[PDB]
Structure formats: structure tokens, C-alpha cells
Design a protein around this ligand. Sequence first.
Ligand SMILES: Nc1nc2c(ncn2[C@@H]2O[C@H](COP(=O)(O)OP(=O)(O)O)[C@@H](O)[C@H]2O)c(=O)[nH]1
Ligand SMILES: Nc1nc2c(ncn2[C@@H]2O[C@H](COP(=O)(O)OP(=O)(O)O)[C@@H](O)[C@H]2O)c(=O)[nH]1
Ligand SMILES: [Mg+2]
Ligand SMILES: [Mg+2]
Lengths: 257, 249
Amino acid sequence: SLSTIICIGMAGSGKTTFMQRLNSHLRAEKTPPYVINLDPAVLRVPYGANIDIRDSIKYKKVMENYQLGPNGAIVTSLNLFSTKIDQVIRLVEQKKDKFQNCIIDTPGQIECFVWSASGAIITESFASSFPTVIAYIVDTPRNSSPTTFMSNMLYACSILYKTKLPMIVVFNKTDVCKADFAKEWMTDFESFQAAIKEDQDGYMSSLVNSMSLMLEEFYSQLDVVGVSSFTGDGFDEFMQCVDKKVDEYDQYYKKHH
Amino acid sequence: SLSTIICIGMAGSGKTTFMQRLNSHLRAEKTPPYVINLDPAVLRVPYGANIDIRDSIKLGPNGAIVTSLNLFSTKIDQVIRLVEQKKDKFQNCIIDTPGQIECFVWSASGAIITESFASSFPTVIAYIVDTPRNSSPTTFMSNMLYACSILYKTKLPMIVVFNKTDVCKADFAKEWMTDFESFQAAIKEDQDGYMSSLVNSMSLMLEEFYSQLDVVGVSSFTGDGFDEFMQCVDKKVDEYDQYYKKHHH
Ligand SMILES: Nc1nc2c(ncn2[C@@H]2O[C@H](COP(=O)(O)OP(=O)(O)O)[C@@H](O)[C@H]2O)c(=O)[nH]1
Ligand SMILES: Nc1nc2c(ncn2[C@@H]2O[C@H](COP(=O)(O)OP(=O)(O)O)[C@@H](O)[C@H]2O)c(=O)[nH]1
Ligand SMILES: [Mg+2]
Ligand SMILES: [Mg+2]
């Protein structure tokens, strides 16, 4: 019965803080999740994790023993973990009627998780055993430039395609910067064309014009919410987007896994 | 035996000029193509077309274009059969499209037309890039994302064609696609902060996109680069057989 929520997003966008607040929110609803941390580099985890990659794998140690830098040691830790993925999935399976959701925190860097073989295997394993939803975390205060916003959205699209999972775009940190502008840009594309024309010269506008149709087709697939992981604002709405995406998953997405 | 080349690109990038030069180049190689024009809005066509959408077909701009495409797509079976009849008399079928790219690949009728050709012949997308306009790293990247979305939408092999190299050489772009750290450097210099950060993660994603493409620089004015383009076409026809034919029935 359990569904899996995988938090994915740019470093510093708030994945871990979002995870903490989601956890407290679900517990307050008397539906505490099963919590997994897959960031091997993190120093302390500000919530209780049921499975922590750092337990089986000592991140500094893999750095030293394998002689690689940050990105390498993160991906190596993920490889080692992915070795035990069958066991992990079975563990979650045992708990699948005791917990409404399994929620998963990922490495800080998005590409360490979705463009590594091992991260893709981990994701595929979860997708193949439970309804699984990608919560794509957006650092809202940093995406006010229309070109930055659009690049970020193209990236989310590529992730949507790569993972073949339903996506919820989560504009985080609304306590600093509200997400109205972005919702509008995704809803009324002529506003985005206006922002682009003002901000950027010429060809961009024209480019963005054709992309209007393409982007609209992307945005229709998404669910979209604004949250503050500091205040807990918007999380009820996120969980509604989760239930919707679990439904869609059943119909549309289950066939791909 | 014939393969189909569909020219797709931003308005003004040179699709029609590229078609003219490709036509003359192929005729010079004693392998004249079967020529199709699918731009209903064009005033004169600077080459001889075997099938012109304007013949059968005489809101606003994009509405009328898409409507013309609908009407045309009604006769797509006939069109395909016509090309099929000629498939051993012509080495290639080359296709010019509406000025606006979304009129053709994000309309139902344009998608049907493309699917029909993909289902009957090896079909390759020549994605035409207006090189002088894509010197800004962000503009270039947006354009490339767009090409990627097209690659996915059409499920066809893609050749990125940096056109107008007589005005602006395509070295910089080839470099950006080949050596990604150079692109990161161009972005860091040109743009602040979050965009650079963005472009870092995308490095892996974009590398995966670029590895699928073939890439050529041409001048449709001088004919420079077209031999190379046709080599890319042959390569893509091979790939099409193996990898792509399974996605089209
Ligand atoms: N104002 C505000 N700051 C946030 C929020 N979420 C995260 N942050 C801050 O952004 C930084 C990165 O957060 P973190 O949870 O570590 O992001 P992660 O790298 O994606 O896992 C931290 O200093 C957070 O306190 C939020 O909802 N509101
Ligand atoms: N220098 C140069 N200019 C070109 C080339 N190809 C096209 N052009 C110019 O760019 C425009 C081409 O428009 P066109 O071929 O109709 O683009 P379309 O809308 O995609 O069909 C014209 O102004 C041409 O003079 C080229 O290879 N070199
Ligand atoms: Mg974190
Ligand atoms: Mg034209």
C-alpha cells in the first residue's frame, strides 16, 4: 500500500529541509513515513532515518580507499549501496502496510543520483516495487531570472524523461520568495514570453516562442506546489499532489517498470 | 532504397536556402532528390518541388499554417505511395517545412506527416541552426534543449546543422558540444551564479544528448560543408535501420 516519494533537486534547493518538514507533517497527520537517506556526504541528518547510506558506507573512507574526489566518492558510495538494493526493497516491502509513505533524501548534487548507473538502478528498483513519485525541489529565490527558470525547467524535463516517473515540481522557500511568478510563467505562457523579451534580447524571445508549444506539453504533465520547508506552508497541498501522482502512476506509469 | 531528410529549424535559420543548396549539391552528384515543400505560406520556392503543399491548398498566421497542414495530412497515404513509387529512382526525398518550427512538430498533422515518412522510409531530421544568432552561451543552450525535445518528440535520428558559416564559423559550437568545460567557462564568464551551477549538473545530461547527434557546419550560400552533411546522412540512415526502425509502424 505504501508509495515512495524521492526528493531530487539542485544542491542547496532544500531537499533535506523539505524532508525534515514533510516528515514532521506526516507524523502530525498520524501517518509517519519510512525514512531513507541516500546522501553519503551529509554530516548530520536533522530527522530520524530508518535506512541511512552512511551506516553501511563511511564516505570519508571511500574517498581515501578509492582515491577519488567529492563526486566520485558520492557515486562510489551509491554503487556500494546499490549492491544491497534487493535487501533494501524487501525491507521496505515488509513495512509496506505499516507506513503510508516511504520518503527518500538524495545526494546534494542532482547528477550524482540521476545520471549515475547506481542511482538509476536504485530509482528503478523503487519504481518497480511501489508507486514512486519524484518531488523535484526548486530553489525559488534563485530562479527569478526567466532564463535561469527555464534552464531549470528543461533540466526537470530531462529528469522526468530519464526516470519515467511522475513529477511534482516543488517551489521551495516561499517564505523568502513567493512562487506566484513561476506558477504564472507555467500557466500563462505569454507572461513568460513577456518576461523573456524584457530581460533578454531578440533571438531568445523567438526561441522561447517555438518552445512555447513544447514547454506547454511539459508543464501539463507536472503537478506544481509552493512550499516553505521552514514554516510548513503548502505541505497539505503537496500531499494532495502526491495522492494524485500515485493515481496517475497506477494508470500511466506502472507499465514502464 | 530512398531515404528522407526533413529540414527543421527556427524561422530564418535557412531551411529553404539549405534545401536549395542541398538540391543543387545532390544534382551535381548525379543523384537528384525528390523534393517536397510543406510551407504553405512561402511566396516563391527557389527550387523545383515535386510536391508542393501550396498546390492543393491556397485566425492568423500559425492557425492558417496548421490548417493547411491538416488539409494536406488528409492526403498523406497518397503522398507516401507517390514517394514509394519513386523510391528506386531517387536517392533521397528532401522536405522543407513551415517557417515556424512548432507549426510542424507540435501540431497533430505535422506529427502525422513525420510519422508517415518515418514509418515508410529511413528518415533523418536536419535540425538547422542559425549560427550567427547563437553566440550567446544561454541562447545556444536553449536552442540545444529545443533540439533535444524535438529529438525525443520525433524519435528520429538528428543531424545538427550549423548554417551560415560564411558569416559565422561553427568552431565555437562544436567546441562547446565536444569539450564541455569550455561551455562551462563561457557560461561562467557570460552569466552569474545560479546559471553556472545549473549548467554543471546538466553537463552529464547534455553530454548524453550530444552523443546522439551528428554535427556539421555548412554555408548554404557557398555549398561548403554539404559533402560532410551527406556523410552524416548516410551514417544516420545506417543507425536508423538498427536503432530507430523499431519505433515506427
Ligand atoms: N528560507 C528557507 N530556507 C531554506 C528552506 N529550505 C532549505 N533552506 C535553506 O537552504 C539551505 C540548503 O538546504 P538543504 O536542506 O541542506 O538543501 P539540499 O542540499 O538540497 O539537501 C539550508 O541552509 C536551508 O536552511 C525553506 O523552506 N526556506
Ligand atoms: N550568409 C548566409 N546566409 C544565409 C544562409 N542560409 C540562409 N541565409 C540567409 O538567411 C535567410 C534564410 O531564410 P530561409 O532560408 O527562408 O529560412 P527559413 O524560414 O528557415 O526557410 C535569408 O535572409 C538568407 O539570405 C547561409 O548559408 N549563409
Ligand atoms: Mg541536504
Ligand atoms: Mg522557407
